[PDB]
Design an enzyme around this catalytic site. Structure first.
Site, PDB file in Angstrom:
ATOM      1  N   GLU C 129       0.822  -1.208   0.000  1.00  0.00           N
ATOM      2  CA  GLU C 129       0.000   0.000   0.000  1.00  0.00           C
ATOM      3  C   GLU C 129       0.857   1.259   0.000  1.00  0.00           C
ATOM      4  O   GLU C 129       0.413   2.306  -0.488  1.00  0.00           O
ATOM      5  CB  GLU C 129      -0.964  -0.017   1.189  1.00  0.00           C
ATOM      6  N   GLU C 194     -11.312  -4.640  -1.437  1.00  0.00           N
ATOM      7  CA  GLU C 194     -10.344  -5.193  -2.414  1.00  0.00           C
ATOM      8  C   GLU C 194     -10.950  -6.327  -3.250  1.00  0.00           C
ATOM      9  O   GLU C 194     -10.945  -6.201  -4.448  1.00  0.00           O
ATOM     10  CB  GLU C 194      -9.061  -5.598  -1.694  1.00  0.00           C
ATOM     11  N   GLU C 228      -2.747  -6.271  -5.351  1.00  0.00           N
ATOM     12  CA  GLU C 228      -4.044  -6.318  -4.687  1.00  0.00           C
ATOM     13  C   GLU C 228      -4.588  -7.737  -4.586  1.00  0.00           C
ATOM     14  O   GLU C 228      -5.291  -8.058  -3.620  1.00  0.00           O
ATOM     15  CB  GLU C 228      -5.038  -5.423  -5.422  1.00  0.00           C
ATOM     16  N   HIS C 231      -3.888  -9.235  -1.579  1.00  0.00           N
ATOM     17  CA  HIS C 231      -4.663  -8.602  -0.479  1.00  0.00           C
ATOM     18  C   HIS C 231      -6.011  -9.310  -0.377  1.00  0.00           C
ATOM     19  O   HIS C 231      -6.480  -9.496   0.727  1.00  0.00           O
ATOM     20  CB  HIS C 231      -4.810  -7.097  -0.687  1.00  0.00           C
TER      21      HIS C 231
END
Ligand SMILES: [Fe+2]
Ligand SMILES: [Fe+2]
EC number: 1.14.13.25
Lengths: 389, 136, 511, 168, 389, 73, 136
Positions: C129, C194, C228, C231
């Site tokens: 991030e 996400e 991502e 994530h």
């Protein structure tokens, strides 16, 4: 295919023609410097400052913030998303910190990637060289495997101390400094375990499992004070400035530097260890890079804040006396390890250990203590730890 | 087959016909799907993997695979699972290629995705709940 | 000795990670939570620090090569349709705060987990991030250097504070990530934010960018999402780690439904507005994009498949579907009416835009299109008109309210999306709420939701003074950053705004 | 009302005048507790300075914190509230109160009041954050039990709002 | 501007439309593998082979070439641009060599760039650490500054031996192996001088000039045999296979490995030198990478060529006996250096030097001698060099 | 000891390059030529091996980025 | 001024007029020139150096400079010499920038070019013959 194949405005003749007709023949403003209003620390704005500063959306009731109003959603009970209750220290502007190495994300991973790939090339060559053959096998199997292996838990504990720091701290440049410091600590721990796994491929019957190192870290009195300090810094406090100061500027700068540089790295170059200095070269490079940023945050800025410097030094001096005491105790337990190694004059005798302690505490006095007004007697701390020799 | 197309089912309808089915009562709760969606960012390495791995050996072992061209990326949907062996991709490309290099251009996963050895897997299975994750 | 060449591969180190943690009485998260994350949880991506850096640096070199070498040499930065180059001021800087706050949120989850491998999954996200914060910044930095209007690309970290759309972004992608139960934050951030919404926001948007001439955003955003997807695995691992906790049966579906409504409340109308009204060339109707990515694929592959373990289809889904069809057109009325408070230049839909809207959203012409065409005749674009549509709304009884919970604006007299006005007085203060799910949140948790809205802060002040004080001007100090057209001439200045004599009211004074 | 500018206005200037005249830890502690009871939380006494109270509160905190380091012994900074109470005793007291709460409405009021009275610099940061975290865990467990049980008409009455308008 | 601003065919709507109309709707061939006809050494063609192989335009009268006819322009007198007269060795195909590390230009500079940048980060941290303080100052000023400094001339001489190799050799993969080997040798020499310049910034009065090292290399009897061998390999022969074999597989593998690893690197880890092992880590990594390629060219290929292997081993065994003799002499002069260092048991006493020589010659017998049929008595060579101890 | 952070820049090493050669009777080119290149000649670009690689690798990364990422897409 | 334009002098003529002067007897030997030509490859860093260094401070101290756009590269010609300080470029770009980084995108030199310190110089002088090269 079931869906339209979208035509690109850049290269499709029809769409490019329409776009060209809509673009004005002149610029609508001449200010092209991204976030031109950031105040530069150096001669001109750096890309590091441009990409980092004011990403954190602090309102004006957190010192330095440009926004306004309350947060949109708070904790049950009313804890703010970020707030002044997170630390005892105060400042006129939380955005004032600058990493002197100016690391945003890209230079940080660029540099570590170089170390990642070069390490593997070095190990493949070291194995081909057969250079393990000259390492004293007692240093290898008793001190290296067991007690260097156990040090990974000190690094791992310091790593985890940053989890609440990463959530709680109050500006973007501080957050980057803290997270990069955290990854380097866990990198250190994984690198120590990498060395052990490497030696296990070259020396049959070398056990690279963490079982013995973990046992020694948790129950061997040599690490008893170190483990106590690390457990307190990690899980005993949540003031995020206290964690960074205690972890990096006191504990790791005294116990950590002695353990890594004065014991394991230095004595590797008396027992013919040509492998360990490759790994400590990295941990010590990471320590000096982190110190530059810790120094800026605490020594250069917070200890001299125009309104709160004396206020801040009061807390920093209190923290320092408490955690320096824990670190002196940790070193006193640790110097017992010297009873297990060959006595070498000027290295592992009482005079060599005393000169090593004089380096760590003398450096620390110059790097940190003198700059926040903390009064320390180097000789008295050396005597205090020698008590355990 | 074509149940995995981007514009499958309701997506073919327009105007009021779309609205009617979008607001139909049976479509107000989620419907469990056994599919996975894989998005690959366009690049030299990926375009070769698409044509010589996914659309040959991949579709031979999973005929449900649909690949669609979304300009900047490849949109892929299949029943069950999709698997890409980075070691096979390296042989195809003629250069070193670990599973971590493959991930340079893997852009999205709707599904349970994981790395084991040289293999990247995206699966409809509930990894860690129904089937445990393992080490090398 | 054996002299064969050997190294140590990343997955050889990773196998020992779980044993790095050790037990002591104080080894517990510092953050309030109703849940207990199981100590044996494993992570789907075997990443160590050195290999993390090697992998991410390789992504960077290719991305920066494309940007700084190839696309710059092609002059790509000024080949973007003006509507879209303006829209990217908002998309990339608003996304930036989500990237930034996700650093802190992932650190809070790293704190909250007990398994070393689960800590490691969150830690990699913490670092990602930071990467994405600097990537979003780099987009606006690049646009500032190369696109024909750098204003707003060059200062949004302060000019966003002027307007009402920014407040709603802070709820879904800032405060919602870090303020609450670690698990409630995890579902807001990872399993919904996400796994569900970054697919339209970051992946699908690249096709819209390319259609409108922008090859800068695909180069970056597609690299952003490569991180991502790891994530998304973090959020799923959160669910795994609390699956055998009896608290999960009591609480999870409540936190999940709250998080789903929270995210959709802003992103469903805001993304549809930016995609369809911030573009010239459209890819597909937003409601179809939402159907594909949100309802069918996310809902079926994530939520639908978790039904085996007590996860229910969110109760608020039916309300969310009505928003997906109409709420972005509702928001457009507010966004166009309050254009001077933004930091981007806008364009009313033209004749072919209007035909496209009516064909894909039948009824649009008779409700929304009629309003837009009336404003055009009144002089919406013309600085010597003295016309600002916010007063037109007030003069016709179409008051605008701010939801005390979501900060999303609401025009009850015109909205076709989900919602209805509720005005409560409590302890001497009036509050406007707009839907059943947000009202319950505020009634049960009033001390979580005390956010000042723009009417409370700006009450009684004249528009131009608020914009001047907020630095919503170009480098000449007089011309607005925001504009109601995308042409190169006839830009509005502070005095053109002041001539309209627009003063902020208290919308709740009448109750 | 006609609002003044956001960051620089007569309300903030006047309160900074009052704050400058605090000269002792005891006086500043009473000032900040009174301020926080009067102007913070949904149970505040007045919304009159709604848009300025958070900045003013910051300035009171700054004055109190400097007075602490100028006038208290170091050990007091670590282990005592500025009320004179033992920090550890305050912690035990308020955790016991919330664990004895019988409704969400009793629990919520205990947590909010704990923050109004002991927010730093009144209580030391480490003790405060730990206590606030324990209180929030209890508050969430009660509130999130059967979250959708009571219909909105019921919750409106339990909360005690005057309904001014419901759109039909 | 005075000249037309050229419109881009990729993005100009008019030119893009014309280009699109001229591009066929289908491919005109399906073979997309660049130089598909190269025979792969491994499972599938590598990019390294694709970009390298048959770049050299050899005709069919140089074994392996695909072209035909005489060169277009030769030397005065008739020397061919490339020809079989350049070396005694023979083969059925000069293109058969493969670097096992598969280095074309990009991976080679990518890797060295990582080492370039990491080195500077390590030096900045090492200076900040003050780690110089523990180095024995006699080792530092007498052995390190003078005799390690002089070793740079051995590396530099080996570097220059490749100039005629780079001109004369007969295929592309061989040429890449040789030039990369050459740059690594000159890199070694510059790195040794970098270490000395670095120590000069930390220790006042440390003289980093090359004057003393050059004097010692040219006139100190310790380096007399080494210098004689290097001058002969560089300037005394032009057979390009002889230069590569003599330089890397005999001289550098015996004298070079002893000097770098067994003396300077190993004894740095008995006299507390934490800086020198950082630099020898690089030279030893470069030696092992080069050896992989030398091994492929000579051991795997030329010594086993289906038609000329026995023919080639005849020359390789002759070369080996001549140059091994020169290298044994060079080591006999060199071990005199031990008279100038502190006697440490198992390191610098007669037993430690004999075990070190047994490592270098024993490794060499396994790596090289056994594989070309060269018969060597390790014990006898150890005794021969100990004569100078 | 002085603990200021220092490195060694490329041009600091390059200044000592000229002294790397040394004199012996056989130190002469192997190739036929009518000319004799003067022994004191200096070079216009001060490049050492490590800096050569750093400079060329940076050119490569940008070139291959443009080719394999952007232009392929 | 315009004697340094790409299309200066004979280059403006076309057809037979060009031929006549191209084959004129006085144009069959070289004519010594005091110019230098510098070619810069287009890139983010170079385009900033061109507009904020070469075309401002550079042309202020050497008014003979002509810059022309050749699509992929910048063509620059000046009397005497052109000098670019990498340290000034780094301040402009906000990132580390040595003379070796500047050379990443310096594509051609017609003239005597050399590096000294942070400075890149291309000069009509005969370096090493008329003026000696130096160290730092
Ligand atoms: Fe992100
Ligand atoms: Fe993320």
């Amino acid at each position: 295919q079931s869906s339209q194949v979208t035509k690109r405005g850049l290269t499709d003749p029809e769409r490019a023609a329409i776009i060209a007709a809509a673009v004005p023949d002149h610029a609508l403003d001449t200010q092209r410097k991204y976030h031109y209003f950031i105040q530069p620390r150096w001669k001109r704005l750096s890309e590091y400052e441009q990409l980092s500063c004011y990403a954190q959306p602090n309102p004006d009731w957190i010192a330095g913030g440009l926004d306004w109003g309350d947060w949109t959603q708070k904790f049950h009970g009313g804890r703010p998303s970020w707030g002044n209750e997170s630390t005892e220290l105060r400042t006129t502007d939380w955005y004032r910190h600058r990493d002197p190495a100016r690391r945003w994300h890209h230079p940080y991973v660029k540099d570590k990637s170089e170390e990642a790939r070069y390490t593997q090339r070095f190990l493949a060559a070291y194995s081909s060289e057969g250079s393990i053959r000259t390492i004293d096998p007692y240093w290898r199997d008793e001190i290296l495997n067991k007690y260097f292996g156990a040090l990974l838990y000190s690094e791992y504990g310091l790593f985890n101390a940053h989890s609440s720091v990463g959530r709680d701290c109050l500006s973007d440049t501080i957050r980057q400094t803290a997270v990069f410091a955290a990854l380097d600590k866990v990198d250190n721990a994984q690198m120590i375990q990498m060395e052990r796994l490497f030696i296990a491929k070259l020396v049959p019957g070398f056990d690279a499992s963490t079982d013995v190192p973990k046992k020694i870290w948790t129950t061997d009195p040599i690490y008893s004070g170190a483990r106590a300090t690390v457990q307190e810094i990690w899980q005993g406090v949540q003031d995020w400035n206290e964690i960074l100061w205690a972890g990096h500027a006191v504990y790791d700068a005294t116990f950590g530097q002695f353990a890594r540089r004065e014991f394991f790295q230095r004595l590797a170059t008396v027992y013919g260890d040509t492998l360990t200095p490759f790994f400590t070269a990295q941990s010590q490079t990471y320590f000096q890079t982190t110190r530059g940023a810790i120094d800026d945050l605490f020594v250069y800025c917070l200890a001299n804040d125009s309104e709160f410097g004396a206020h801040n030094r009061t807390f920093l001096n209190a923290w320092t006396e408490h955690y320096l005491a824990s670190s002196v105790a940790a070193l006193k337990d640790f110097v017992g390890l010297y009873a297990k190694v060959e006595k070498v004059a000027g290295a592992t005798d009482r005079a060599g250990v005393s000169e090593a302690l004089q380096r760590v505490f003398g450096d620390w006095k110059i790097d940190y203590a003198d700059k926040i007004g903390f009064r320390v007697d180097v000789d008295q701390k050396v005597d205090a730890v020698l008590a355990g020799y | 087959s074509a149940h995995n197309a981007y514009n499958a089912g309701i997506m073919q309808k327009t105007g009021k016909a779309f609205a009617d089915e979008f607001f139909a009562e049976e479509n107000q709760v989620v419907h469990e799907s056994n599919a996975v969606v894989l998005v690959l960012m366009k690049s030299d390495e990926i375009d070769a993997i698409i044509e010589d791995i996914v659309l040959k050996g991949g579709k031979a072992k999973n005929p449900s695979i649909v690949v669609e061209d979304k300009a900047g990326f490849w949109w892929i949907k299949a029943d069950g699972a999709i698997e890409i062996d980075a070691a096979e991709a390296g042989e195809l490309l003629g250069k070193p290629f670990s599973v971590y290099d493959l991930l340079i251009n893997v852009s999205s996963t709707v599904g349970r995705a994981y790395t084991l050895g040289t293999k990247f897997t995206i699966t409809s299975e509930l990894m860690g709940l129904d089937r445990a994750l393992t080490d090398i | 000795v054996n002299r064969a060449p050997v190294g140590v591969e990343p997955q050889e180190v990773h196998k020992w990670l779980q044993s790095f943690n050790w037990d002591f009485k104080e080894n517990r998260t510092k953050y309030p939570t109703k849940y207990h994350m199981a100590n044996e949880t494993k992570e789907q991506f075997k990443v160590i620090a050195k290999e993390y850096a090697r992998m991410e640096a390789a992504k960077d070199e290719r991305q920066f090569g494309t940007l700084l070498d190839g696309l710059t040499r092609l002059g790509a930065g000024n080949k973007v349709h003006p509507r879209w180059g303006e829209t990217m001021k908002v998309i990339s800087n608003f996304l930036e705060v989500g990237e930034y706050n996700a650093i802190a949120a992932s650190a809070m989850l790293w704190d909250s987990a007990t398994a070393a491998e689960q800590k490691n999954g969150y830690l990699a996200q913490v670092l990602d991030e930071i990467r994405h914060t600097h990537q979003c910044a780099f987009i606006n930095h690049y646009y500032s250097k190369h696109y024909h209007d750098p204003a707003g690309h060059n200062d949004a970290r302060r000019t966003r504070a002027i307007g009402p759309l920014w407040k709603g972004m802070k709820r879904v992608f800032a405060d919602g990530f870090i303020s609450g139960d670690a698990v409630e934050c995890s579902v807001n951030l990872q399993l919904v934010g996400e796994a569900c919404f970054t697919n339209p926001l970051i992946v699908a948007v690249t096709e819209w960018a390319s259609a409108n001439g922008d090859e800068i955003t695909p180069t970056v955003f597609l690299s952003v999402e490569t991180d991502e997807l790891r994530h998304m695995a973090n959020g799923y691992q959160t669910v795994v780690s609390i699956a055998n906790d009896p608290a999960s049966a009591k609480f999870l579906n409540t936190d999940l439904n709250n998080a789903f409504w929270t995210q959709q409340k802003y992103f469903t109308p805001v993304l549809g507005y930016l995609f369809e009204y911030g573009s010239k060339f459209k890819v597909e109707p937003w409601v179809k994009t939402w159907n594909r990515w949100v309802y069918e694929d996310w809902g079926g592959i994530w939520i639908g498949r978790l039904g085996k373990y007590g996860v229910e289809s969110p109760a608020s889904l039916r309300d969310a579907k009505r928003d997906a069809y109409w709420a972005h057109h509702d928001l457009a009325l507010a966004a166009y009416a309050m254009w001077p408070l933004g930091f981007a230049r806008l364009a009313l839909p033209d004749e072919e835009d209007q035909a496209w809207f009516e064909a894909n959203y039948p009824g649009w012409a008779d409700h929304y299109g009629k309003i837009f065409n009336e404003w055009k005749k009144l002089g919406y674009e013309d600085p010597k008109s003295g016309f600002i549509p916010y007063q037109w709304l007030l003069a016709n009884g179409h008051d605008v309210y701010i939801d005390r919970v979501s900060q999303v604006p609401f025009i009850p007299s015109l909205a076709k999306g989900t919602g209805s006005l509720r005005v409560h007085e409590f302890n001497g203060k009036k509050h406007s709420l707009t839907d059943d799910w947000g009202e319950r949140q505020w009634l049960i948790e009033p001390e979580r939701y005390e956010c000042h809205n723009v009417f409370e802060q700006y009450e009684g002040r004249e528009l131009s003074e608020v914009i001047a004080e907020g630095h919503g001007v170009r480098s000449d100090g007089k011309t607005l950053i925001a504009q109601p057209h995308t042409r190169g001439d006839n830009l509005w200045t502070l005095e053109d705004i002041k001539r309209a004599g627009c003063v902020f009211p208290d919308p709740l004074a009448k109750f | 009302a006609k609002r003044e500018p956001i960051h620089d206005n007569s309300i903030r200037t006047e309160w900074e005048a009052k704050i400058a005249k605090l000269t002792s830890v005891d006086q500043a502690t009473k000032f900040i507790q009174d301020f926080r009871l009067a102007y913070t939380s949904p149970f505040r006494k007045s919304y009159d300075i709604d848009v300025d109270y958070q900045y003013i509160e910051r300035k009171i905190e700054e004055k109190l914190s400097v007075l602490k380091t100028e006038k208290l012994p170091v050990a007091d900074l670590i282990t005592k509230a500025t009320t004179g109470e033992d920090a550890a005793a305050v912690e035990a007291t308020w955790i016991a109160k919330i664990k004895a709460a019988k409704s969400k409405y009793e629990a919520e009021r205990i947590h909010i009041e704990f923050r109004q009275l002991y927010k730093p610099p009144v209580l030391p940061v480490n003790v405060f954050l730990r206590t606030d975290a324990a209180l929030g865990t209890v508050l969430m467990e009660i509130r999130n039990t059967d979250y959708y049980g009571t219909p909105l008409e019921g919750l409106r009455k339990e909360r005690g709002v005057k309904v001014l308008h419901l759109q039909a």
